Write a protein that binds this ligand. Structure first.
Ligand SMILES: [K+]
Ligand SMILES: [Mg+2]
Ligand SMILES: [Mg+2]
Ligand SMILES: [Mg+2]
Ligand SMILES: [Mg+2]
Ligand SMILES: [Mg+2]
Ligand SMILES: [Mg+2]
Ligand SMILES: [Mg+2]
Ligand SMILES: [Mg+2]
Ligand SMILES: [Mg+2]
Ligand SMILES: [Mg+2]
Ligand SMILES: [Mg+2]
Ligand SMILES: [Mg+2]
Ligand SMILES: [Mg+2]
Ligand SMILES: [Mg+2]
Ligand SMILES: [Mg+2]
Lengths: 99, 204, 193, 203
RNA sequence: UUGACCUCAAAUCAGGUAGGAGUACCCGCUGAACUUAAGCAUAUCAAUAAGCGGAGGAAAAGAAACCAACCGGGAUUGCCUUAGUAACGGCGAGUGAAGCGGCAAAAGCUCAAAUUUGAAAUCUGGUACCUUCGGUGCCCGAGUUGUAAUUUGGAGAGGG
RNA sequence: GUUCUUUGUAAAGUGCCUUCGAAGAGUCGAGUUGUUUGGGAAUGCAGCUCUAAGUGGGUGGUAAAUUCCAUCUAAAGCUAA
C-alpha cells in the first residue's frame, strides 16, 4: 500500500511514514449493541409482518428469488435494499416452520 | 356533552373493530378474590412516605457524626419498586421476582410489550385491574407498574401460591392468547338483528 | 448592435444591479476600527498574544501540497504526546481540533516539537498568586514562525542509471491504464474451460 | 431500553398491532377540534428524544391539517401572464405540512414558543401532528439552565421564521455541495452573489 | 353506608404573557409584468418588485451524514481570487456557482437513548422570617406515562 | 489590590487490565408531479404512493449491474466576534 513516489501510476504520491491512527468511535454507527439486537428480536415476536412483507414471503415460498427480489426492488427504494430485504426474509423463513 | 359522547364512543369503537391478539390480552383481568390478596400482601411493602424519609435521614445524620456510621445506620429496605423504566430494566436484569402492570394505560405502546417481554425471561407477570390502585400502593396517583424483587422470610409463602395463581392465568396462557384475536362484538341492535335473522332463517 | 473586430464580452449587467452596489469607502475607517479592536482586546484579556498556537500541517490539493501552512487546532494525539490533556491546552491558548487525524510522522513530530517549544516559552500564572508584569506579547504566530521544511541538500552527485524517465513515466501510466484489463484476461486465460 | 421498545415498535407503523391503534386514534382525533390541548404525549418516547421533559411549562397540542397541493388562489384560474405561469392546480407550496401546522398552534398559544413537533396519525384528507411547546414565563424554565435559552426573546416565534427543525429542513439549510445553492440562506446568498463590490482603488 | 384515577370544564379565582408600531438592514412564504431575444411562446427581466407572516442590535448560519482523492485540510460568516470559468440555455439572447490559496475574526459544545433503587435525591406555587433580581423553614401540588447526578461519539460507562 | 470569608474526605483531571459501548422514522431512500438551480438519466424544496436497516446510512457532480476503498454520521438542541 506504499505510495510509488511519482506523480503517475496507481499509488501515486510520495513515500511517507504511516501510522494508521487509532480509529474513531464513529464508523461504529452500525454497531452490534447486543441489547438492541435483543430488542429487535423481541419486537419481531410481538409485531408480525407487514401485508407487503407477507406478500414477499409468499413469493419466496412459491414463485422464486428473482421475482421476489424484483418485487422488493419495486416496493423499496434500491436494489441493494431489496437484496437485504430478501436476505432477512430468507433468514426468518428458515427460522420459521421449515427449520 | 361531546367529551362524554366522545369517550363513550372511544370504547364502543374499540370493541366493534377486531382487536389484534397482542393487545386485548389485557382484556383478561386478574380475578376478584386473588386481587384482594395480592394487594393485601403488597400493601405491606409501601415505600418511604414523605414524612418517613425525613426521620430516617435525621436519625442517620444525627448518627454518622458521633457514631461514625458508614451509611449503615438504617436497615436494608424492602419496598415495592415502581417506574416503567425502572421495571423494564429489572426484568432485563432478571431481578424482578413479581411484576404486575396496570391494564388501563392510555398509550398502550407503554405497556403492550411488557407482558411479552416478561414471558421471555420467565418472569411472572400480572395484567391487573386499575392503575389508580397502583398509585395508592406506592403513595402516588398513578404508577402503571409494580415490581417486587425481595421479600421477608415469613412472607415468601404468600408469593409462591400467589405466583402459581397468577402464572396459571397469564403466563401459562401466553401461547394461546398470543394467537387469539380480539374484538368482534356487534351492537345490541345489531346482535338482536342477527339473532332475529338466525331464529327465522337458521332455525326453521 | 455588433461592431467590427472586437472580442465577445459577457458583462452581466441586465438585473437591477443599481440597488446592490457595495462601494468600500469604509476601508480606511474599518482598518482603524479593527486596530482599535485589537488594541482593546489585548488590554482587556490577560497578557496573552491575541491568538492560539496553530499546527504545522500540510495543504491538500496537489496544486498546493508542496507547501506547509497553519492548521486550525491540534489533534488529540499530538496534545497527548506533549504531556497535557486536551481540555487544559485550550485554557493555555493551544488550539485543539478533533477532526484532523495524523497519518504523517514528520507532520506529527513537527507539531509535538513546537508543543514542547511553546511549553518552554510559557509562564502559567497561578490562580491565587502574585502575577508580576509579564511584558505582554501581541502575536504568538509572530513569535513561533512557520518554516518550510527542506526536502534535500544543496548539492549532490548525479546517479544516472540510464533510467530514461519517460520509459519510467510513460510505462507507469500505460501499466495503470490497462491494469484492470489485464486481470480481466486473467479471468478468461485462467478459466481452463 | 424502556423507550426503545416504544422506538422499535414505532418502526413497524404498518404492523398488525399499530394498525388497530392508529385507525382507532385517527377516529379519536377527528372528532375533537382541529387544535386542542393534549393532556400527555401520545409518544413519550419521541417527545423525550426530541427534548420534552415531564416538567411544568411544557405544552403539547394536537393539530390536524388538510393534505394535498396548494391550489393557486387566482380567480377562476385566470393568471394573466405568460403560459408558464398559467399552472394553478399543480402548485406544491414548498414548505412542509409540519410547518403549516406548527404555525397554527404557534398562533393559538401566542404567548408560547414552539420547540418541535411530530406527527401521530393521518388519513387521505388530513394529517395530524402533535406539537411541543415550552413556557418561558414559568420560573421552572427561566431557571433550569439546560432550557433557559427559551426565555430569550431572540428565538421568539421560532416557528414562523423557519428556525424550527422542519423549518431548517424546508429552507434547504445543510452542509455540502448538494446544498451550495441554499447554504447561508437562499435570499442572503442571492444578494451576495448579485452585488457589485467596488473598492476605492479600482481593481 | 366514600374517596382517590383519567379526561373535560367554569370562575371578574392567584399570577402571568400575545396582539400593535416601526421595518434601513435581517428570517421565511407568495409572486408577477414591463423589458431582452431586433417578431415570439421555453428562456431573460427574477427565484426581483408588489402582497403576507416573524426577530434583533445585528438577524441568519455555525461546530460536518463537510470539503476532498492530495504527503490530504477541518464550525460558521466576510473580503481578494477561483471566474464571466465548470455547467445550464429556441446551445440563441443569455445565465453561471463550488474545492483549493491569501486575509479578517476565532470557540466551543448539549439532551433522548444507561434502574440511583439502601431510599425523586428533582421542580412551581402559598405562608412566616431575613441579609430580597433572592435565601431558609413549613405546607399543598407537579412528577415514576420520570423530575436531579452521571453520558453525547472528539467518546464514554460498569468493574478491578 | 486584599480583607471577612474555607469550602471539603465534597468534587474533578490523568495510567494500566477487562466487560461493554446504548447514538434520534410516514424519516432517509425510491417512483411520479410542480417549482427552482450552473447541477446537466433529474441541485434543492414540496405534494401523493411505496417505504426501511445496523459490520447500516449519506456522499464521492453520467443512469445501472458486479467488487472494493475514502470520507463523515441525518431525520434532536445552544453559541460571542
Ligand atoms: K401573473
Ligand atoms: Mg384573576
Ligand atoms: Mg422582444
Ligand atoms: Mg425592438
Ligand atoms: Mg417586497
Ligand atoms: Mg428592538
Ligand atoms: Mg456583531
Ligand atoms: Mg446569529
Ligand atoms: Mg442557531
Ligand atoms: Mg459533532
Ligand atoms: Mg471551514
Ligand atoms: Mg437567473
Ligand atoms: Mg398541572
Ligand atoms: Mg466525567
Ligand atoms: Mg444523532
Ligand atoms: Mg414559487
Amino acid at each position: 500500500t506504499v505510495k510509488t513516489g511519482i506523480a503517475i501510476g496507481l499509488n501515486k504520491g510520495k513515500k511517507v511514514t504511516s501510522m494508521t491512527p487509532a480509529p474513531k468511535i464513529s464508523y461504529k454507527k452500525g454497531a452490534a449493541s447486543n441489547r438492541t439486537k435483543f430488542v429487535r428480536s423481541l419486537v419481531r415476536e410481538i409485531a408480525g409482518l407487514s401485508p407487503y412483507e407477507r406478500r414477499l414471503i409468499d413469493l419466496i415460498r412459491n414463485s422464486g428469488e428473482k421475482r421476489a427480489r424484483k418485487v422488493a426492488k419495486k416496493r423499496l427504494g434500491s436494489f441493494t435494499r431489496a437484496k437485504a430485504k430478501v436476505e432477512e426474509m430468507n433468514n426468518i423463513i428458515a427460522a420459521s416452520r421449515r427449520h | 356533552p361531546e367529551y362524554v359522547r366522545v369517550q363513550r364512543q372511544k370504547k364502543i369503537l374499540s370493541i366493534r373493530l377486531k382487536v389484534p391478539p397482542t393487545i386485548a390480552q389485557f382484556q383478561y383481568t386478574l380475578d376478584r378474590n386473588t386481587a384482594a390478596e395480592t394487594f393485601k400482601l403488597f400493601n405491606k411493602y409501601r415505600p418511604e412516605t414523605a414524612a418517613e424519609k425525613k426521620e430516617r435521614l435525621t436519625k442517620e445524620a444525627a448518627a454518622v457524626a458521633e457514631g461514625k456510621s458508614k451509611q449503615d445506620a438504617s436497615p436494608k429496605p424492602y419496598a415495592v419498586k415502581y417506574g416503567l423504566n425502572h421495571v423494564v430494566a429489572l426484568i432485563e436484569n432478571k431481578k424482578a421476582k413479581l411484576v404486575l402492570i396496570a391494564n388501563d394505560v392510555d398509550p398502550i405502546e407503554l405497556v403492550v410489550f411488557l407482558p411479552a417481554l416478561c414471558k421471555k425471561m420467565g418472569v411472572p407477570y400480572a395484567i391487573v385491574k386499575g392503575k389508580a390502585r397502583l398509585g395508592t400502593l406506592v403513595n402516588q396517583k398513578t404508577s402503571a407498574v409494580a415490581a417486587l424483587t425481595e421479600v421477608r422470610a415469613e412472607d415468601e409463602a404468600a408469593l409462591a401460591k400467589l405466583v402459581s395463581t397468577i402464572d396459571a392465568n397469564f403466563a401459562d396462557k401466553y401461547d394461546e392468547v398470543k394467537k387469539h384475536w380480539g374484538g368482534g362484538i356487534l351492537g345490541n341492535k345489531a346482535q338482536a338483528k342477527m339473532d332475529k335473522r338466525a331464529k327465522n332463517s337458521d332455525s326453521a | 448592435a455588433i461592431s467590427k473586430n472586437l472580442p465577445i464580452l459577457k458583462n452581466h449587467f441586465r438585473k437591477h444591479w443599481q440597488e446592490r452596489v457595495k462601494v468600500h469607502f469604509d476601508q480606511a475607517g474599518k482598518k482603524v476600527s479593527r486596530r482599535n479592536a485589537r488594541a482593546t482586546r489585548a488590554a482587556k484579556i490577560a497578557p496573552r498574544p491575541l491568538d492560539l498556537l496553530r499546527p504545522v500541517v500540510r495543504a491538500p490539493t496537489v496544486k498546493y501540497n508542496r507547501k506547509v501552512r497553519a492548521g486550525r487546532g491540534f489533534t488529540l494525539a499530538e496534545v497527548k504526546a506533549a504531556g497535557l490533556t486536551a481540555a487544559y491546552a485550550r485554557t493555555i491558548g493551544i488550539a485543539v481540533d478533533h477532526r484532523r487525524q495524523n497519518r504523517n510522522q514528520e507532520i506529527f513530530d513537527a507539531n509535538v516539537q513546537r508543543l514542547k517549544e511553546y511549553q518552554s516559552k510559557i509562564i502559567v500564572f497561578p490562580r491565587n498568586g502574585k502575577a508580576p508584569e509579564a511584558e505582554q506579547v501581541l502575536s504568538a504566530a509572530a513569535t513561533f514562525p512557520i518554516a518550510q521544511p527542506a526536502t534535500d541538500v544543496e548539492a549532490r552527485a548525479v546517479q544516472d542509471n540510464g533510467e530514461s524517465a519517460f520509459r519510467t513515466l510513460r510505462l507507469a501510466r500505460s501499466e495503470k491504464k490497462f491494469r484492470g484489463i489485464r486481470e480481466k484476461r486473467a479471468r478468461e486465460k485462467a478459466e481452463a474451460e | 431500553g424502556a423507550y426503545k421498545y416504544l422506538e422499535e415498535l414505532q418502526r413497524k407503523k404498518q404492523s398488525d398491532v399499530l394498525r388497530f391503534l392508529q385507525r382507532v386514534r385517527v377516529w379519536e382525533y377527528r372528532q375533537k377540534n382541529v387544535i386542542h390541548r393534549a393532556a400527555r404525549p401520545t409518544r413519550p418516547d419521541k417527545a423525550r428524544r426530541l427534548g420534552y421533559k415531564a416538567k411544568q411549562g411544557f405544552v403539547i397540542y394536537r393539530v390536524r391539517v388538510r393534505r394535498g397541493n396548494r391550489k393557486r388562489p387566482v380567480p377562476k384560474g385566470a393568471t394573466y401572464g405568460k403560459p408558464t405561469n398559467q399552472g394553478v392546480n399543480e402548485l406544491k407550496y414548498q414548505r412542509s405540512l409540519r410547518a403549516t401546522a406548527e404555525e397554527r398552534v404557534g398562533r393559538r398559544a401566542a404567548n408560547l414558543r414552539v420547540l418541535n413537533s411530530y406527527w401521530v396519525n393521518q388519513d387521505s384528507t388530513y394529517k395530524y401532528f402533535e406539537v411541543i411547546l415550552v413556557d418561558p414565563q414559568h420560573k421552572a424554565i427561566r431557571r433550569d439552565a439546560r432550557y433557559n435559552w427559551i426565555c430569550d426573546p431572540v428565538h421568539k416565534h421560532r416557528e414562523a421564521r423557519g428556525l424550527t427543525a422542519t423549518g431548517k429542513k424546508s429552507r434547504g439549510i445543510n452542509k455540502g455541495h448538494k446544498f451550495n445553492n441554499t447554504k447561508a440562506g437562499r435570499r442572503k446568498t442571492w444578494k451576495r452573489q448579485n452585488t457589485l463590490s467596488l473598492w476605492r482603488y479600482r481593481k
